[PDB]
């Protein structure tokens, strides 16, 4: 009935609004990111590794079934 026509690869706007507002959210996980950005979970998971390299998100707890990310340190 309700078909989730998720987005496979990032647009210019979606990649722009991933670099700015995502480091404002307190909770970043690939489950909610694929839900909120209206994108695939493969694209959601692949979006979060470079932010860890770019220094915009922090990993605190990684696991095979769930990985969780947050903002940068407030200081």
């Amino acid at each position: 009935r309700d078909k989730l026509n998720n987005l496979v690869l990032f647009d210019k706007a979606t990649y722009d609004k991933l670099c700015k507002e995502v480091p404002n959210y307190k909770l970043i996980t690939p489950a909610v990111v694929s839900e909120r950005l209206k994108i695939r979970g493969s694209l959601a998971r692949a979006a979060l590794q470079e932010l860890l390299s770019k220094g915009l998100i922090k990993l605190v707890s990684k696991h095979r079934a769930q990985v969780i990310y947050t903002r940068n340190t407030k200081g």
């Binding site: 909770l27 489950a31 979970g41 605190v60 707890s61 696991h63 079934a65 769930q66 969780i68």
Partner: protein
């Protein structure tokens, strides 16, 4: 650390129970602190041995329902463990306190029964079990056929049930089961 224990990293102390009726039936402080929500068992043997079981273990033991997940406490402990950082990285307070606040606000006071239904007040033990139960199945239904995982679903509702914003599944049935009892009383 023979003096104090840390539930992974969470404090044994400074968890407060608001309603005084449920403080004897919530086992979180000064005698029931454990490093894991897993233990040997034996608390299901006697009638009233159930009350002193730690509530994190009780929520864990009430979690592996619906068939394929039965007898899988090794993975539901993993679900509970990750679910506490989600509370600390959404609200920012002690997840033990948020779980405690979810029990009080999801537990109905009175409930109707066949004896034409007459409304009778529930036991403080009965209020604990039903409040635990309503917030657990909602995570089961929210994680069913959805991108959102089971670990997030546990942390969503008990945060919502702590504040009672009528968006958790546990809050709505708590309102309805007392609204029905309020009618035929």
């Amino acid at each position: 650390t023979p003096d104090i224990k840390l539930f992974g990293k969470w404090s044994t102390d400074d968890v407060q129970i608001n309603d005084i009726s449920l403080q004897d039936y919530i086992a979180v402080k000064e005698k029931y602190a454990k490093y894991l929500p897993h233990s040997a068992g034996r608390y299901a043997a006697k009638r009233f041995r159930k009350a002193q079981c730690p509530i994190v273990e009780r929520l864990t033991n009430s979690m592996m329902m619906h068939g394929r997940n039965n007898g899988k406490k090794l993975m539901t402990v993993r679900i509970v463990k990750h679910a506490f950082e989600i509370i600390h990285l959404l609200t920012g307070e002690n997840p033990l306190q948020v779980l405690v606040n979810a029990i009080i606000n999801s537990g109905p006071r009175e409930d109707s029964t066949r004896i034409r239904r007459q409304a009778v007040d529930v036991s403080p033990l009965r209020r604990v079990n039903q409040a635990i139960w309503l917030l657990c199945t909602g995570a089961r239904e929210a994680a069913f056929r959805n991108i959102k995982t089971i670990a997030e679903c546990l942390a969503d509702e008990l945060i919502n049930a702590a504040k009672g914003s009528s968006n958790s599944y546990a809050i709505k049935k708590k309102d309805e089961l007392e609204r029905v009892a309020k009618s035929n009383r």
